Amino acid sequence: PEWMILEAVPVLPPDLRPMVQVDGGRFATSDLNDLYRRLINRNNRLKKLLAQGAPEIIIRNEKRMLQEAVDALLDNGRRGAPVTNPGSDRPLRSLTDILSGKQGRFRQNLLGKRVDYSGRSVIVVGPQLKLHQCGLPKRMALELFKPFLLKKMEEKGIAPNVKAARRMLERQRDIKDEVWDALEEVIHGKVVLLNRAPTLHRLGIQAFQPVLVEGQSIQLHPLVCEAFNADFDGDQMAVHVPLSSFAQAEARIQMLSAHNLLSPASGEPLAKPSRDIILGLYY
């Protein structure tokens, strides 16, 4: 317990409290820096106040400010709320507001992060498709599986090297039909994940083998349209890629659609013939 008292204030890193060139010459810095300056100025003015000679009232006066300041960087608002000069009566985000905040650190450490090998487009019923697979736009697959393709280009005559294989695809008109054959070869037995708007349960994400197809839409199987509460009035589904041989192993072993047939809620099937199939089978 002697540590609760502060005499050495850790300063947050620099790149984490940037100073950046914006537009026209506008700059942009993390609010933390106005607060840091606060403390440093006060701390300095204090020293020089002690040294110059010290009239009591003034030294406390400062020590007060100083204190307040030391609060500011740590947590703003617990005691009064500091403001950047007339423009925004806004609480300069305190280190606290950083960690907790309306949208803070552990907070958005759970709202979400953006995946690097992702995609998203409109969905469309894929009647002939088997539960096993899913229709994925080659155009999308290209970008998605770019690196997997690049290398595969080099293993074949289509390109000398990576950087080459890259510029070979930087423009749309430049793709030899040999590339599609390469990607279609790269995707052989790999599978991807498809997500739906609200991911309410684990079946909210399922794995399928991509069967590359033309156009913009994503071909989805009718049977799993029940697991994802996804109808076709424009509902769009995202798509992710398992990069490790491990992630791929799990993905297609324990996450593949055609494997998870019965619900975790009830021992009742979720691969039930939805609307059109019954109607048929009934009549």
């Binding site: 009232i57 406390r60 006066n61 007060r64 400010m65 307040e68 009064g80």
Partner: peptide
Amino acid sequence: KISTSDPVRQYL
């Protein structure tokens, strides 16, 4: 409480 008043009073 609020910092201006207290010093004002303090030296005044």
